Write a protein that binds this ligand. Structure first.
Ligand SMILES: Nc1ncnc2c1ncn2[C@@H]1O[C@H](COP(=O)(O)OP(=O)(O)OP(O)(O)=S)[C@@H](O)[C@H]1O
Ligand SMILES: Nc1ncnc2c1ncn2[C@@H]1O[C@H](COP(=O)(O)OP(=O)(O)OP(O)(O)=S)[C@@H](O)[C@H]1O
Lengths: 674, 88
């Protein structure tokens, strides 16, 4: 009675069909049976990584027994799964727990060879005492079966430490299934999710949800890292087929919130607030417009679907009538229906029939959208709005960087070549090095690129190679070996990519580092991974590595290349993408930097409503004064500051330039007045 | 992970079957220190990365929360101040 009291049957649940299909894994069940029905050491223990499927095999064996496909001496066994969590509970006296264990063991002893005990998470029996050692006597006679399943490391962490027991067990290895076996298991399990949710599931989806989740989720194992995607896409589609679909359910909520905020911002007795109120209304209206446009779209197709349906119904009614005409022998209506009314409505149906958005089944891209919500990595289809930004990318980078089209092109052509699903999948999404004279942009372009993709300049992982001067500093970006002072901290680079692996990495002044920090970027590049202290393996197959330097600084093109081939390894300059070289600024190009800097300054002193008004000779002199062709565009910034900001501050903190003003600037013989 | 002395371990069966719904919240760098050690457990969990907002939306959050403090402290708060309390 103790068995039915504490433990729980498994074959009884199998009889009610409460288990899931167990597609595949015949070799492992064969091995488990041929080990279980042995004479001695009749105790199998399943060993495998978490997620490979280790309880599923035992459920499959239970199904096989209840079906009757097992060898001779395995008929009507009634496998039982223990529960020590329920066994040791409220047994708060000296002689209760071991007594209950003795009772269970004796009730198992009674049944000669029927009961096949099963313990999931076998490692829980190493303690449980204050005991748990009343298993060696029974296993010393082969009186139990006791199939168990644990993970790989907990085995050597809780059992191998007790090498007496490990002698009495027989190991079975369970490796992860490959992509085809995973597709098979998914095609087997599709039905249960189809019935639990309320939607259909195609097969191209079951193929994509297996080929993707092996490439992107590099932390789990197939039989579940593939199931999760489908089981999330199904629920998303059910929620969509409920009240209004996604991409409307967000615009509506943004519009309502904007209306609420404006309804109380309007009643403000201020002047600073009177200008921020003039943009709130603008955006609210410009989004009301989009909500209206989107609403009509989904509202129609809706009607079209209903039309089609009606036409189907009508058709069928006529078909039923042609049957009847033949039942009644009515020729007048017989063919009138059979080649008149029926094909008439059929054609009408067919004409409306082509009538996307929320079709009614999880396509091959809902899985991709789920994977994109996961891991932040976007793998979609260039949904007709981003394919315009990815064409204006160059002209848009031209808003912050000027000139250097030779580099802006080779930077842009490294993103579309990955969006179009073309570039190699085992290499970073692009890793190339800038080098040239100082003050040209080789750091500003990396910032402009890292903002084109995230809209916040601080979201790029950044490490300065000017500190890593010796070997022993390499451990700063990889963590520390096992068992040292700083070990619960991990690395500094690695940890910024193991979370949100879509960032953009920037190595500043690569040549200032010790030529052993170079020796880890060898396997960073051209393979896209490295191993930190804890043995983990992060994956750079989606990052965009960028490197800057200042080598040579004087050569046309061959002296800088000589410096590179002398200070870099051939097997390290052989892995990179195009090695771009910048040109330098010209007396013409400086005006388009001058006006950018002046707009920057106007935006800076704009929180106090203090816009400027610059003159044409002012800009021309300001560009023709600071130009020297050795320090790039920094002297221009210094000159702007020293020539405008100091006079402006002198005038400002002496009154007379109070808030809400606009001062004009004009040229005097050498300096410029205000 | 604690409570033991075989604890937070009797919940592994019920988790993998979806019986009890679980909703949690742990800071980003104690996860990898107390959970990812036990990958047998963190398999059962679905991660939801929560990135920090920007100033333009912090403005909105403050505009919504203003009235909750207006009542607590018997004062009034300017929107030109709710903007500065985020830009600054
Ligand atoms: N061969 C298979 N046939 C059908 N479903 C499978 C198969 N292998 C795995 N699965 C499914 O994939 C999941 C596997 O989860 P489990 O095997 O219970 O995890 P586990 O293998 O027990 O790992 P631990 O150590 O218990 S965390 C379940 O949802 C199973 O239904
Ligand atoms: N091509 C450019 N376009 C716009 N601003 C630029 C450009 N080159 C330099 N600047 C300005 O100069 C600063 C950026 O200097 P950078 O050239 O990026 O420094 P750097 O590229 O790291 O060069 P070094 O050799 O490392 S000092 C910012 O204040 C920019 O406004």
């Amino acid at each position: 009675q103790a068995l039915q009291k504490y433990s729980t049957d498994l074959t009884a649940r199998a009889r009610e069909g409460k288990l899931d299909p167990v597609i595949g894994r015949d070799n492992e069940i064969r091995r488990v049976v041929q080990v279980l029905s042995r004479r001695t050491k009749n105790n199998p223990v399943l060993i495998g990584e978490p997620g490979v499927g280790k309880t599923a095999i035992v459920e499959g064996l239970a199904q096989r027994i209840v079906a009757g496909d097992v060898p001779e001496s395995l008929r009507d066994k009634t496998i039982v799964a223990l529960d020590l969590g329920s066994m040791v509970a409220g047994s708060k006296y000296r002689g209760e727990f071991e007594e209950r264990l003795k009772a269970v063991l004796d009730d198992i002893k009674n049944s000669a060879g029927q009961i096949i005990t099963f313990i999931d998470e076998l490692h829980t029996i190493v303690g449980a005492g204050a005991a748990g050692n009343m298993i060696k006597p029974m296993l010393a006679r082969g009186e139990l079966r006791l199939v168990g399943a644990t993970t790989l490391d907990e085995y050597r962490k809780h059992i191998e430490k007790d090498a007496a027991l490990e002698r009495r067990f027989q190991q079975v290895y369970v490796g992860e299934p490959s992509v085809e076996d995973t597709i098979g298991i998914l095609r087997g399990l599709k039905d249960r999710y189809e019935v639990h949710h309320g939607v259909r599931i195609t097969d191209s989806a079951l193929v994509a949800a297996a080929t993707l989740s092996d490439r992107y989720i590099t932390a789990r194992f197939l039989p579940d890292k593939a199931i999760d995607l489908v089981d999330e896409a199904a629920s998303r589609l059910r929620m969509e087929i409920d009240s209004r679909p996604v991409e409307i359910d967000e615009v509506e909520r943004l519009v309502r919130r904007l209306e609420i905020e404006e309804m109380a911002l309007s009643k403000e007795e201020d002047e600073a607030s009177a200008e921020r109120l003039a943009k709130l209304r603008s955006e609210l209206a410009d989004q009301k417009e989009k909500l209206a446009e989107l609403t009509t779209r989904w509202q129609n197709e809706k009607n079209a679907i209903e039309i089609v349906r009606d036409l189907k119904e009508q058709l069928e009614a006529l078909r039923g009538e042609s049957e009847r005409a033949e039942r009644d022998g009515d020729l007048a209506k017989a063919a009138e229906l059979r080649y008149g009314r029926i094909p008439e409505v059929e054609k009408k149906l067919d004409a409306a029939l082509p009538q996307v958005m929320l079709k009614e089944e999880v396509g091959p891209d809902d899985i991709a959208d789920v994977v994109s919500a996961w891991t932040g990595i976007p793998a979609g289809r260039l949904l007709e709005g981003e394919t315009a930004k990815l064409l204006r990318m160059e002209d848009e980078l031209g808003k912050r960087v000027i000139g250097q089209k030779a580099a802006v092109t080779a930077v842009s052509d490294a993103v579309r070549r990955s969006r179009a699903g073309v570039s190699d999948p085992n290499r970073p999404t692009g890793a190339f090095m800038f080098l040239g004279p100082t003050g040209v942009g080789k750091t500003e372009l990396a910032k402009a690129l890292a903002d084109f993709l995230f809209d916040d300049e601080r979201a790029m992982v950044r490490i300065d190679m000017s500190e890593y001067g010796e070997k022993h500093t390499v451990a700063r970006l990889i963590g520390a070996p096992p068992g040292y002072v700083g070990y619960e901290a991990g690395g500094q680079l690695t940890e910024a990519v193991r979370r949100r692996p879509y960032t953009v990495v920037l190595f500043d002044e690569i040549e200032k580092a010790h030529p052993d920090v170079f020796d880890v970027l060898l396997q960073v590049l051209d393979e896209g991974r490295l191993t930190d202290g804890h043995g983990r393996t992060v994956d750079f197959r989606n990052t965009i590595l960028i490197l800057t330097s200042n080598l040579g600084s004087g050569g046309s093109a061959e002296q800088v290349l000589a410096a590179v081939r002398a200070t870099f390894k051939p097997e390290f300059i052989n892995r990179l993408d195009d090695v771009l070289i910048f040109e330098g600024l010209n007396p013409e190009e400086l005006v388009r930097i001058v006006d950018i800097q002046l707009a920057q300054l106007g935006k800076r002193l704009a929180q106090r409503r203090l816009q400027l008004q610059v003159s044409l000779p002012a800009k021309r002199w300001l560009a023709q004064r600071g130009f020297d062709p050795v320090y790039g565009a920094r002297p221009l910034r210094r000159l702007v500051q020293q020539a405008i900001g100091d006079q402006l501050a002198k005038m400002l903190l002496a009154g007379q330039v109070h808030d809400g003003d606009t001062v004009p600037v004009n040229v005097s013989p050498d300096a410029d007045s205000l | 992970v604690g409570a033991g002395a075989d604890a937070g371990n009797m919940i592994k069966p019920m988790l993998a079957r979806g019986e009890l719904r679980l909703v949690g919240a742990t800071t980003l760098d104690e996860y990898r220190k107390h959970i990812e050690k036990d990958a047998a457990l963190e398999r059962r969990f679905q991660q939801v990365y929560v990135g920090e907002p920007s100033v333009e939306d912090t403005i909105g959050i403050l505009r919504g929360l203003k009235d909750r403090y207006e009542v607590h402290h018997g004062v009034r708060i300017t929107d030109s101040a709710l903007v500065a309390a985020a830009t600054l």
